[PDB]
Amino acid sequence: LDNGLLQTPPMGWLAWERFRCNINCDEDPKNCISEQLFMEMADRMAQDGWRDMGYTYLNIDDCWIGGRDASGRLMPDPKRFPHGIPFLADYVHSLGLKLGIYADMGNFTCMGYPGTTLDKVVQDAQTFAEWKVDMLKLDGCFSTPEERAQGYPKMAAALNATGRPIAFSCSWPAYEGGLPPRVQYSLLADICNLWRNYDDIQDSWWSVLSILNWFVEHQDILQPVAGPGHWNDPDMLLIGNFGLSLEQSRAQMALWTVLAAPLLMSTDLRTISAQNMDILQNPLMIKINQDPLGIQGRRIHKEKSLIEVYMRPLSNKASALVFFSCRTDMPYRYHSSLGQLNFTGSVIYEAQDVYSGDIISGLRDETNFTVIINPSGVVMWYLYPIK
Amino acid sequence: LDNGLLQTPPMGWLAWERFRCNINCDEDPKNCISEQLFMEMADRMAQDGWRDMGYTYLNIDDCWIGGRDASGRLMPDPKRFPHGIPFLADYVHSLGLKLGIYADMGNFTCMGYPGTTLDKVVQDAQTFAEWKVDMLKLDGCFSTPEERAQGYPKMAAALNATGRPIAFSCSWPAYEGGLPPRVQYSLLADICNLWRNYDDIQDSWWSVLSILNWFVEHQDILQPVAGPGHWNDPDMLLIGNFGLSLEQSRAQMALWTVLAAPLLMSTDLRTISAQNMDILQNPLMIKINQDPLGIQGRRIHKEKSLIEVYMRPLSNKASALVFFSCRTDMPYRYHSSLGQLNFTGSVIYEAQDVYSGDIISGLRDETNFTVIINPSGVVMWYLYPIKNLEMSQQHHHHHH
Ligand SMILES: *[C@@H]1O[C@H](CO)[C@@H](O[C@@H]2O[C@H](CO)[C@@H](O[C@@H]3O[C@H](CO[C@H]4O[C@H](CO)[C@@H](O)[C@H](O)[C@@H]4O)[C@@H](O)[C@H](O[C@H]4O[C@H](CO)[C@@H](O)[C@H](O)[C@@H]4O)[C@@H]3O)[C@H](O)[C@H]2NC(C)=O)[C@H](O)[C@H]1NC(C)=O
Ligand SMILES: *[C@@H]1O[C@H](CO)[C@@H](O[C@@H]2O[C@H](CO)[C@@H](O[C@@H]3O[C@H](CO[C@H]4O[C@H](CO)[C@@H](O)[C@H](O)[C@@H]4O)[C@@H](O)[C@H](O[C@H]4O[C@H](CO)[C@@H](O)[C@H](O)[C@@H]4O)[C@@H]3O)[C@H](O)[C@H]2NC(C)=O)[C@H](O)[C@H]1NC(C)=O
Ligand SMILES: *[C@@H]1O[C@H](CO)[C@@H](O[C@@H]2O[C@H](CO)[C@@H](O)[C@H](O)[C@H]2NC(C)=O)[C@H](O)[C@H]1NC(C)=O
Ligand SMILES: *[C@@H]1O[C@H](CO)[C@@H](O[C@@H]2O[C@H](CO)[C@@H](O)[C@H](O)[C@H]2NC(C)=O)[C@H](O)[C@H]1NC(C)=O
Ligand SMILES: *[C@@H]1O[C@H](CO)[C@@H](O)[C@H](O)[C@H]1NC(C)=O
Ligand SMILES: *[C@@H]1O[C@H](CO)[C@@H](O)[C@H](O)[C@H]1NC(C)=O
Ligand SMILES: OC[C@H]1NC[C@H](O)[C@@H](O)[C@H]1O
Ligand SMILES: OC[C@H]1NC[C@H](O)[C@@H](O)[C@H]1O
């Protein structure tokens, strides 16, 4: 979407994966979807390095809406958002952050809150701009394919007409199977800054693998369509939560990075471990995710040993390599060379291991190397030519 | 198997899951299958609390064998076990530990090492006894159903005839689909101390779930067959390795415990984290696993919320409850009561949370309680009548 926004993938925090539709503030005031939750997460983003490392969006998901007023104007739940959305936008902006919100192109949101029907698209866009929202995720429950086909472009046009830059995250393709012929990716790129292609992530490794598999199976279609201002979105990061081991957490971060994915966390920043913080705040990892060329990577090799290799092209003739072990036994000593991974010519390279920081220098195409990859884990290199 | 052994489930360490068939000692001397590996793990078991908490077996798995000598007697790989197996058993015994070994009922071991064919069953049994081995896992690759039907009983007979008590772990049912009519658990209980019923565990939560699912699906058949001296074996613990998160690690320990499973670790004890050690050395958990009644637990409740409840009966009218969340979203507040979990009227209970150590007092059948369970995680209770604390302190004794 040619609105000047998200020339690199968005980074931030989104409520949904970890906090879901918890509206029981009487019994669970610390974890319910409320003004307080968003304010506390904003404070953590401002104080604990997140904003400074690039995590700038703080996004509200489903279950925020209270009703519509006598003029049809959307309102938040008055008990859980007592000061209203402008207050929250203004608070988040005071901290150098951006505020995302959520609506559904349909009769109801997925959890049954008031929907943004076709006759409300313009009014709701105007309301969000007036509130000084910076991003909108538009979900697709409770609509027909024909409604979505009218509604997603209508919303893009309506947001534009407000005059406020609002990053536009579109769930449209996920409701239509994610693939041609039903999904037109050239159209999506013109109307959306990013789109959810596929199934909701859940807090499990099986879920990450399911998503990674679908993205790799369809990479010939998906890889070319991503670039500055228009991203594929394989859904939120699980790092900090319950289902992923340490190796798996590191793998998700590396693979999302090689895929030029959004880095949208969804975890309790108030209690996040040092180890998980260190994964998410890895400066080189973030540099790679945010590479200005915005070229999505692809799986380039899959071996009978169950080691997979991903490669992402980067600026200044650099590359990212992810060596990923699908094995479920023990560490594996993977032997390769840059020549076997389709680096050609007479270039000499240097690599930095993204997680260890160690430097491997003087790699020619014919130079044999070994990387030790743990099960359900990765080794990631930032590779560049040297003199 | 009525050989006096494993009146409670075996606890120890087995090389296979974590170290597999790594024989490259030239390139990987710290992690290859070798005497050094076993000696180092033995030291860790003796020094780091493992033995003292009940973990007594140190078990060799596949890929130890060098060949058979001119008389047909098994030899370990001379490059990787230079001092021989008797030396290793002596060493292990000197530390108050027991040595387990591995063979295959068939032409070759699964990894292609010399097999214990029907003609070698007796010689191999005698060799193991002579080496002062304490446990044998007998795998089932490269055999036919008839060879296994003859061989597993033949080995049990051969072990018995040596006069040395050797705990006998039988893979027979895993190679027969784990269920009647092909598997005869009455015979297995008479010839084996434990048996692998099902698929090899791998270092993944999916794997743990697949095994749990199978054991629960078939629990009406499997639960009654377990008891002192004859256990179901859902395979090794993954705690300490790569694939399980903290919640999943705590879950596997709890669920293996309620299933009266062996607690056979397979992890690098030299680098294991304090967090993982704390799971595996939890004293109340181990007490429950080792309960003298040896009654395997069951899944008693499954809810549309994807919360499952398992219960294991224990000594002194106590029970273990494991509340298990199959959810993949966020912590869940599970509301229940003992009456809804089929506890029978009038008894007042107390519970100790096995992981937090917290005590919950005044539980009657009707009293509503809430437990907070994390995704792919558990809450486990040790539950006892609050008349058994008093009665355990009013036992009168006399000399004789
Ligand atoms: C509502 O919708 C309109 C229409 O889509 C948006 O207006 C567009 O805004 C974008 C982003 O600001 C504009 O794109 C930028 O144009 C710059 C100048 O281009 C001139 O020359 C071209 C022909 O060569 C003309 O078409 C155009 O009218 C201009 O006169 C470029 O310099 C910018 O370059 C960017 O990309 C390159 C690499 O791709 C980078 O190197 C640069 O750093 C930079 O990021 C960019 O292309 C676009 O021109 C606007 N179109 C129109 C018709 O005005 C509104 O932004 C939008 N409003 C809201 C509130 O959402
Ligand atoms: C080869 O196979 C034979 C079986 O065919 C095995 O023999 C069995 O060995 C076990 C273990 O040693 C014996 O079990 C023990 O019997 C002890 C004595 O009981 C006898 O006497 C009573 C009289 O009241 C009879 O009723 C009974 O049938 C026995 O004949 C018990 O004292 C032992 O109790 C143990 O457990 C209790 C808890 O349950 C503890 O409190 C005790 O401390 C103690 O540890 C035990 O039951 C069994 O009797 C033998 N069976 C037969 C048929 O002889 C061999 O062991 C086996 N050899 C090898 C090398 O594997
Ligand atoms: C969304 O809402 C519209 C308007 O309420 C729904 O259309 C009505 O549906 C009811 C219940 O089936 C019918 O009895 C009415 O006759 C309909 N009225 C009108 C004016 O259309 C529609 O079914 C809903 N759409 C989706 C996708 O769920
Ligand atoms: C184990 O080894 C024996 C001995 O080689 C195998 O027996 C042969 O099997 C083939 C085909 O199955 C027959 O054609 C021969 O008649 C057998 N040879 C002898 C000398 O008996 C046996 O099949 C092997 N068993 C397994 C399960 O692999
Ligand atoms: C790399 O290793 C292979 C063995 O797989 C060897 O044959 C080859 O000569 C080596 N290449 C170089 C450039 O050293
Ligand atoms: C337990 O909770 C139920 C509803 O969930 C309630 O009806 C009942 O009265 C409660 N029982 C007790 C003993 O408080
Ligand atoms: O109900 C909210 C839920 N709907 C489905 C979306 O894909 C999720 O990310 C989340 O927004
Ligand atoms: O090859 C060894 C391997 N064979 C199959 C067994 O089930 C595993 O536990 C292991 O012993």
Q: Report the distance separating Cα B13 and Cα B277, nearest Å.
A: 13
Q: Report the distance separating Cα A42 and Cα A88, nearest Å.
A: 10
Tokens of A9: 């993938």
CA angle B69, B71, B76 (to 5 degrees): 30
Q: Report the distance separating Cα A33 and Cα A38, nearest Å.
A: 8
Q: Report the distance separating Cα B33 and Cα B138, nearest Å.
A: 18
Q: Do strands A167-170 and A74-76 pair parallel, antiparallel, or not at all (unpaired)?
A: unpaired
CATH number of the structural domain spanning residue A341? 2.60.40.1180
* Cβ proximity of B125 and B105 under 8 Å: no
Strands (DSSP E) found in A277-340: 298-302, 307-313, 319-325, 332-336
Last residue of a domain, one of A261, A290, A319: A290
Q: Which domain holds residue B285?
A: 1-295
Q: Report the distance separating Cα B350 and Cα B389, nearest Å.
A: 10
Q: Do B243 and A203 touch (CB under 8 A)?
A: no
Q: Do strands B11-14 and B263-265 pair parallel, antiparallel, or not at all (unpaired)?
A: parallel
Q: Which residues of B72-88 are buried (b: 16+ CB within 10 A; e: fewer)?
A: eebbbbeebbeeebeeb
Q: Do A18 and B330 touch (CB under 8 A)?
A: yes
Tell me: do B109 and B73 sit in the same domain: yes
Q: Report the distance separating Cα B257 and Cα B253, nearest Å.
A: 6
Best of A18, A62, A203 to disrupt the B interface (most B CBs within 10 Å) is A203
**φ, ψ (nearest 5 deg) of residue B229:** 85, 0
Find the length of chain B.
Answer: 400
CA angle A192, A193, A196 (to 5 degrees): 75
3-state SS string over B137-190? EEECCCCCHHHHHHHHHHHHHHHHHHCCCCEEEECHHHHHCCCCCCCCHHHHHH
Catalytic residue among B124, B139, B233, B235: B139
* Cβ proximity of B95 and B51 under 8 Å: yes
Does the C-beta of A181 come closer than 6 Å to ligand 1?
no
Question: Where is chain A broken, named by the residue before each break, C–N > 2.5 Å?
Answer: none
- Is position A171 annotated in a ligand binding site? yes
Residue type at position A260: A
| B354 contact A CB<8A | no
Which residue in chain B has the smallest CA separation from A247? Answer: B242
Q: How far is CA B335 from CA A40, B234, B323, B372, in A?
A: 29, 30, 11, 9
Q: Report the distance separating Cα A379 and Cα A254, nearest Å.
A: 9
Which residue in chain B has the smallest CA separation from A205? Answer: B205
Q: Do strands B359-363 and A74-76 pair parallel, antiparallel, or not at all (unpaired)?
A: unpaired
* Cβ proximity of A178 and A213 under 8 Å: no
Q: Report the distance separating Cα A277 and Cα A239, nearest Å.
A: 9
Tell me: do A8 and A155 sit in the same domain: yes
Q: Report the distance separating Cα B183 and Cα A106, nearest Å.
A: 56
Give the distance from residue A221's alpha carbon to the nearest chain B alpha carbon, in angstroms: 30
Tell me: do A87 and A222 sit in the same domain: yes
Q: Do B328 and A18 touch (CB under 8 A)?
A: no
Q: Report the distance separating Cα A139 and Cα A5, nearest Å.
A: 20
For chain B, the first-to-last Cα distance in angstroms comes to 34
Crossing angle for the helix pair B246-258 and B205-217, to the nearest 10 degrees: 20
Q: Report the distance separating Cα A203 and Cα A182, nearest Å.
A: 29
Q: Do B242 and A19 touch (CB under 8 A)?
A: no
Q: What total number of domains does chain B contain?
A: 2
Tell me: do A208 and A74 sit in the same domain: yes
Tell me: do A83 and A229 sit in the same domain: yes
Rg (CA), chain A: 21
Residue type at position A241: N
Residue B133 DSSP symbol: -
Q: Which of A126, A127, A119, A11 is nearest to A64 (CA)?
A: A127
Tokens of A348: 């000499």
Resolution (A): 1.5
Separation of CA B162 and ligand 2 centre (Å): 17
CA atoms in the 13 A half-sphere facing the CB of B354: 31
The residues facing B378 across adjacent strands are B324
* Cβ proximity of B336 and B351 under 8 Å: no
Question: What's the burial of A342, exposed, middle or buried (CB within 10 Å: 0-12/13-18/19+)?
Answer: exposed
Could you tell me the maximum CA-CA distance found in chain A, to the nearest angstrom?
Answer: 72
Task: Look at phi and psi of residue B23 and say left if phi exceeds 0, alpha if psi is from -120 to 50, else beta.
Answer: alpha
Last residue of a domain, one of B280, B295, B310: B295
Tell me: do B351 and B261 sit in the same domain: no
* Cβ proximity of A133 and A90 under 8 Å: no
Q: Do strands A231-233 and A378-385 pair parallel, antiparallel, or not at all (unpaired)?
A: unpaired
Q: Which residue has the tokens 């594996």?
A: A332
Tell me: do B227 and B374 sit in the same domain: no
The residues facing B335 across adjacent strands are B370
Tell me: do B66 and B182 sit in the same domain: yes
Q: Report the distance separating Cα A44 and Cα A41, nearest Å.
A: 5
Tell me: do B350 and B306 sit in the same domain: yes
Three-class SS of residue B220? helix
Tokens of A59: 């996004």
Does the C-beta of A3 come closer than 6 Å to ligand 1?
yes
Residue A105 DSSP symbol: B
CATH number of the structural domain spanning residue A181? 3.20.20.70
| B56 contact A CB<8A | no
Question: What's the burial of A170, exposed, middle or buried (CB within 10 Å: 0-12/13-18/19+)?
Answer: buried
Evaluate the CA torsion angle A28, A33, A37, A39 in order and state its sign.
negative
Query: Pseudo-torsion of CA B242, B248, B250, B253, nearest 10°?
Result: -80
Which residue in A28, A242, A245 is closest to B243 by CB distance? A245
* Cβ proximity of A42 and A15 under 8 Å: no
- Is position A69 annotated in a ligand binding site? no
Q: How far is CA B287 from CA B167, B254, B263, B392, in A?
A: 21, 12, 12, 17
Q: Report the distance separating Cα B88 and Cα B41, nearest Å.
A: 12
> Which ligand is nearest to the Cα of residue B336, counting in written order?
6
Residue type at position A332: Y
Last residue of a domain, one of B295, B318, B341: B295
Tell me: do B206 and B185 sit in the same domain: yes
- Peptide linkage before B181 cis (omega within 30 of 0): yes
**φ, ψ (nearest 5 deg) of residue B205:** -65, -35
Three-class SS of residue A362? strand
Tell me: do A225 and A307 sit in the same domain: no
Tell me: do A314 and A272 sit in the same domain: no
Tokens of B311: 């219960």
How many helices (DSSP H) and strands (DSSP E) are in chain B? 13, 18
